[PDB]
Amino acid sequence: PGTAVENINTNVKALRKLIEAKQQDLAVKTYNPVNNGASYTIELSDGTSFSMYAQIAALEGGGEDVVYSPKVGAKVEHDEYYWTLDDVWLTFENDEKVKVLDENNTVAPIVDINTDGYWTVKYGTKSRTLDKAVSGKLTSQFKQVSTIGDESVSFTFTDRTPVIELNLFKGDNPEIPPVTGALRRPISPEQPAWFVHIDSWNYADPQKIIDLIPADIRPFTIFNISLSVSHDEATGIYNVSEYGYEIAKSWLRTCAENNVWAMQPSSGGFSHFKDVSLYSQFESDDKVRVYDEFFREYPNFLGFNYCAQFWGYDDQFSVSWLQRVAHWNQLLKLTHKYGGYLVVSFCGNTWSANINPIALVKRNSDFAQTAKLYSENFIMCEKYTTQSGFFNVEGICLGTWLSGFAGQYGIRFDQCGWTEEKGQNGDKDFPPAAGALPIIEHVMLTGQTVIDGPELIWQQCFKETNAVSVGDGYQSRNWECFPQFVNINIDMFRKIIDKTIRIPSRKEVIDRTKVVILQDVYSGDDNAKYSSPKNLHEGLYLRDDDGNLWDNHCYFKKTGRYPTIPVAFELCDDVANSFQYKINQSTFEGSWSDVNTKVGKFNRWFPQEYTGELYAGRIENGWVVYNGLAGIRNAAIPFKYNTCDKMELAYSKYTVSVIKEYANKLTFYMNNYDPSGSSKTEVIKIYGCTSKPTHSVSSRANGTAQVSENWKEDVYTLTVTHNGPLDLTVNCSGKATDRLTVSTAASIQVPASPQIYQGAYQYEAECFDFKNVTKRVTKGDSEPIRNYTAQGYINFGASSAAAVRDAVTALEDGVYTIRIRYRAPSATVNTVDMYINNTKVGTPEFAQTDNDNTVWNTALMSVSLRKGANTFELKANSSGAGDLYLDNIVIERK
Ligand SMILES: OC[C@@H]1O[C@H](O[C@@H]2[C@@H](O)[C@H](O[C@@H]3CO[C@@H](O[C@@H]4CO[C@@H](O[C@@H]5CO[C@@H](O)[C@H](O)[C@H]5O[C@@H]5OC[C@@H](O)[C@H](O)[C@H]5O)[C@H](O)[C@H]4O[C@H]4O[C@@H](CO)[C@H](O)[C@H]4O)[C@H](O[C@H]4O[C@@H](CO)[C@H](O)[C@H]4O)[C@H]3O[C@@H]3OC[C@@H](O)[C@H](O)[C@H]3O)OC[C@H]2O)[C@H](O)[C@H]1O
Numbered sequence: 001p002g003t004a005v006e007n008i009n010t011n012v013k014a015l016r017k018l019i020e021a022k023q024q025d026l027a028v029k030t031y032n033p034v035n036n037g038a039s040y041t042i043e044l045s046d047g048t049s050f051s052m053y054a055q056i057a058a059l060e061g062g063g064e065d066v067v068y069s070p071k072v073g074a075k076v077e078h079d080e081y082y083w084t085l086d087d088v089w090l091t092f093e094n095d096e097k098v099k100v101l102d103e104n105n106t107v108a109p110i111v112d113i114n115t116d117g118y119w120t121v122k123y124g125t126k127s128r129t130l131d132k133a134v135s136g137k138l139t140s141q142f143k144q145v146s147t148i149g150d151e152s153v154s155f156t157f158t159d160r161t162p163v164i165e166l167n168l169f170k171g172d173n174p175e176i177p178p179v180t181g182a183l184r185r186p187i188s189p190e191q192p193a194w195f196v197h198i199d200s201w202n203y204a205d206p207q208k209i210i211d212l213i214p215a216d217i218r219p220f221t222i223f224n225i226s227l228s229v230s231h232d233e234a235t236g237i238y239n240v241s242e243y244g245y246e247i248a249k250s251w252l253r254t255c256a257e258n259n260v261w262a263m264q265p266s267s268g269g270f271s272h273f274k275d276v277s278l279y280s281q282f283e284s285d286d287k288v289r290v291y292d293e294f295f296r297e298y299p300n301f302l303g304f305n306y307c308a309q310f311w312g313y314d315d316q317f318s319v320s321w322l323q324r325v326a327h328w329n330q331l332l333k334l335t336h337k338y339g340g341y342l343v344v345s346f347c348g349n350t351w352s353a354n355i356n357p358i359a360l361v362k363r364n365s366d367f368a369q370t371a372k373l374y375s376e377n378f379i380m381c382e383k384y385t386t387q388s389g390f391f392n393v394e395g396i397c398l399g400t401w402l403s404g405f406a407g408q409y410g411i412r413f414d415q416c417g418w419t420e421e422k423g424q425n426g427d428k429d430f431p432p433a434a435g436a437l438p439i440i441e442h443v444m445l446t447g448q449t450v451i452d453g454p455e456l457i458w459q460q461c462f463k464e465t466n467a468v469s470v471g472d473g474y475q476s477r478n479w480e481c482f483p484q485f486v487n488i489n490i491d492m493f494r495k496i497i498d499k500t501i502r503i504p505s506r507k508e509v510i511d512r513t514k515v516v517i518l519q520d521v522y523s524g525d526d527n528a529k530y531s532s533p534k535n536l537h538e539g540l541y542l543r544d545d546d547g548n549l550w551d552n553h554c555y556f557k558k559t560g561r562y563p564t565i566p567v568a569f570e571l572c573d574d575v576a577n578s579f580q581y582k583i584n585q586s587t588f589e590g591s592w593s594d595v596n597t598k599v600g601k602f603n604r605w606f607p608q609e610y611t612g613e614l615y616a617g618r619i620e621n622g623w624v625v626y627n628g629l630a631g632i633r634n635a636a637i638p639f640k641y642n643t644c645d646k647m648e649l650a651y652s653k654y655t656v657s658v659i660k661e662y663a664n665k666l667t668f669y670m671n672n673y674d675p676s677g678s679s680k681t682e683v684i685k686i687y688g689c690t691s692k693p694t695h696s697v698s699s700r701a702n703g704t705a706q707v708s709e710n711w712k713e714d715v716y717t718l719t720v721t722h723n724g725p726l727d728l729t730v731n732c733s734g735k736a737t738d739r740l741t742v743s744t745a746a747s748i749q750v751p752a753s754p755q756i757y758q759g760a761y762q763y764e765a766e767c768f769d770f771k772n773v774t775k776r777v778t779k780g781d782s783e784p785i786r787n788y789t790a791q792g793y794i795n796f797g798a799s800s801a802a803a804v805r806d807a808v809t810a811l812e813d814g815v816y817t818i819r820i821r822y823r824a825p826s827a828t829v830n831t832v833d834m835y836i837n838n839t840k841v842g843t844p845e846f847a848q849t850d851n852d853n854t855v856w857n858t859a860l861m862s863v864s865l866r867k868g869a870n871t872f873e874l875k876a877n878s879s880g881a882g883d884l885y886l887d888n889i890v891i892e893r894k
């Protein structure tokens with residue numbers, strides 16, 4: 001956010017500078033559009049970076065017609081550039097023209113509004129009053145910037161200022177060939193993924209989020225770089241994530257430095273990056289370079305996450321959902337070329353049936369082909385963000401994958417999916433323990449290879465604390481895991497890694513599932529053609545207290561006897577056609593809508609494996625058992641592999657368990673973690689033992705546990721009080737021979753690292769350790785300085801005791817170039833020194849920079865780094881001649 005008068009003068013100062021660059025034969029290193037080309041940032045070969053505005057801020061007042069604002073431009077005459085005002089020469093006293101390039105100043109004509117409310121223009125001592133200013137929308141003096149060929153870059157104006165071409169810098173570094181062909185980082189049951197968010201809402205230092213993830217988890221992790229689509233509804237402009245490209249770039253470099261996988265620019269229609277309609281645009285269109293760039297330069301980049309694609313379409317500043325699907329059609333090809341994933345996540349309401357994962361492939365036949373053909377690259381995820389329809393949306397998201405249109409299936413859980421005011425069981429606020437249930441249920445019984453989140457990131461995963469002292473009198477920003485992150489999430493993944501929780505393959509799920517619905521309906525409302533049959537789940541796994549479809553407010557199943565029921569558009573391949581029972585929805589209203597008849601046919605397909613009010617589903621020798629109701633709840637489960645007779649289970653509310661049957665052993669992973677520290681009680685009884693059993697228990701993470709044992713009349717009874725997760729082992733043998741046989745250890749394969757990133761590293765000043773600085777801007781959007789990288793910058797300031805430090809890295813020993821992007825608006829700063837590894841190496845030339853709020857500059861140093869960690873400091877020695885600002889540093893090999 002900024003005033004119209006700032007915007008105008010910025011463009012003028014830019015026009016002066018472009019002309020200066022032209023006659024000094026300077027080159028454009030980089031340019032990039034923002035807010036769909038409302039503004040651009042521009043870097044030249046001398047390191048000068050500045051904004052130009054294609055849209056000007058409204059003029060405070062309220063009026064909203066287009067009205068007059070002065071237009072300072074430039075024409076050429078007798079070989080020379082002179083200032084224009086509204087397409088006539090700019091003159092003051094006499095009729096003397098005024099050169100752009102005058103041998104004394106770098107003062108441009110300044111436009112203003114005086115105190116009688118008239119526009120004015122001043123140039124040194126001279127000054128000129130023009131027309132009355134008037135509240136209204138204004139038009140910019142500048143149109144846009146495009147590229148000509150691969151040589152030229154053109155700046156075009158809206159007045160009669162000529163076009164201005166500058167050469168497009170070519171860098172003499174040999175470009176690094178990208179990764180193509182096969183998938184960069186395969187995902188499968190053997191190689192699952194956790195998407196952990198570096199979140200614009202946490203105002204992250206990516207480096208410190210990465211480090212909060214332990215080593216055993218890291219290799220299975222895919223860091224998800226979240227750009228918030230929070231914006232000003234009137235203008236369109238993004239705040240939280242002001243410069244999305246620049247955040248993504250900065251954090252994607254840190255990821256690439258740390259050799260970890262990474263991928264998120266949209267929520268609903270809103271997106272920091274412009275949608276395409278043709279595959280050609282990925283190379284030919286200077287409005288959409290970001291797509292190719294991330295794949296080309298970062299070998300750890302897996303692609304793009306379009307989350308929550310159910311809202312915000314057809315906005316003034318979004319796109320239609322059709323246009324989005326179309327963008328996916330092209331983007332998916334791009335993704336396939338580079339071995340990437342495109343991820344989509346859906347949560348549902350009544351208004352959004354026509355944009356769900358059925359409609360996705362049923363409404364757009366071209367996307368359907370491109371999806372089918374590159375399913376390996378396409379990942380479809382259930383989101384738990386909306387207030388209803390969870391079983392419908394679970395079926396459909398699962399159906400996408402099994403039917404062959406997506407390669408992997410995932411869950412993105414959210415607190416926000418707890419029912420509002422009343423909640424569930426008598427618990428107003430969402431309790432974290434609840435979250436473990438859907439996830440384990442859908443991972444173990446429906447083949448999810450991707451866990452995403454959980455949300456909200458900043459309530460469930462990480463928070464920033466106050467700054468902390470880190471030696472030598474320096475202080476740093478700091479981040480911490482929430483306890484439920486460690487005690488639910490981290491530990492649940494350890495239980496996948498350690499092969500307790502075996503993820504079934506697609507073909508394994510179809511054999512279990514048995515049945516599919518095909519959505520072959522073309523008549524009726526949006527719900528009739530894209531959503532599942534309304535009473536699909538009734539008298540199956542849907543609770544008594546809950547209701548059908550959009551009155552389905554609870555995601556806990558009443559029973560696990562019947563498997564999650566998938567709903568697809570079509571079956572694309574051999575395997576999808578191996579479904580035992582294919583039911584067309586058109587027949588559904590006739591036959592299956594009678595709840596009793598459905599339950600009758602389903603009962604023949606899916607035998608009773610237990611009784612009681614707990615949730616119990618079995619796959620191979622693994623049970624998921626949980627309690628999603630109030631009060632102690634029970635079940636009687638006859639064993640299928642263990643040689644004892646049966647187990648009777650009695651569990652507290654929101655206790656979840658994973659129970660592995662062995663001929664002479666049982667394991668329980670149990671959890672029910674409350675951060676406030678309460679205990680819960682659980683009771684396990686084994687029947688049919690022909691021997692005194694024994695038991696073993698280990699607490700996990702920050703959990704507690706005590707277990708009591710009771711042998712009596714051939715019943716063995718374990719009483720497990722605990723807070724948080726634990727593994728319990730029961731050695732119990734019986735005398736049965738009618739029992740199945742346990743297959744050998746499922747595979748878990750530790751996912752390979754990405755190739756080593758050979759490009760430049762970046763370290764944002766707002767993440768530096770610091771002492772005695774004037775101001776540290778971690779949330780820049782609300783402050784006066786524009787055109788910065790990531791979310792912020794700092795004002796180092798003039799203190800003689802001012803200093804900063806970060807830890808930087810180097811693939812090996814040698815000379816590197818350190819580019820400090822900075823601002824020195826009032827005076828040159830010759831008074832700050834640089835230390836590498838606690839040895840002073842020079843005094844960067846921080847030349848006076850232009851006063852304008854968008855201008856930054858870059859100061860260079862050559863230095864020796866050694867292989868691995870290096871320490872970087874900037875230290876004042878005296879009082880600065882003026883404020884020094886710092887946005888970042890960028891390190892590259894010479
Ligand atoms: O960048 C942050 C980023 O966000 C992600 O994480 C979460 C998000 O998951 C989520 O985002 C919110 C999603 O829900 C929006 O609310 C829904 C909007 O549409 C409403 O439907 C209309 C009802 O009336 C009808 O007549 C009308 O026709 C319907 O709309 C049309 O429906 C079909 C569409 O195809 C069509 O385009 C649309 O126009 C719907 O009822 C409403 O319901 C929501 O309420 C909750 C209930 O649990 C659910 O979110 C959903 O059911 C929501 O936007 C709302 O907030 C304001 C707008 O700012 C309005 O009230 C409404 O539009 C999204 O909110 C915004 O997300 C971005 C964030 O930066 C904003 O601050 C936030 O307001 O929840 C929040 C977010 O944390 C990423 O992981 C995270 O990094």
Ligand SMILES: [Ca+2]
Nearest residue numbers: 764789792887
């Ligand atoms: Ca910065």
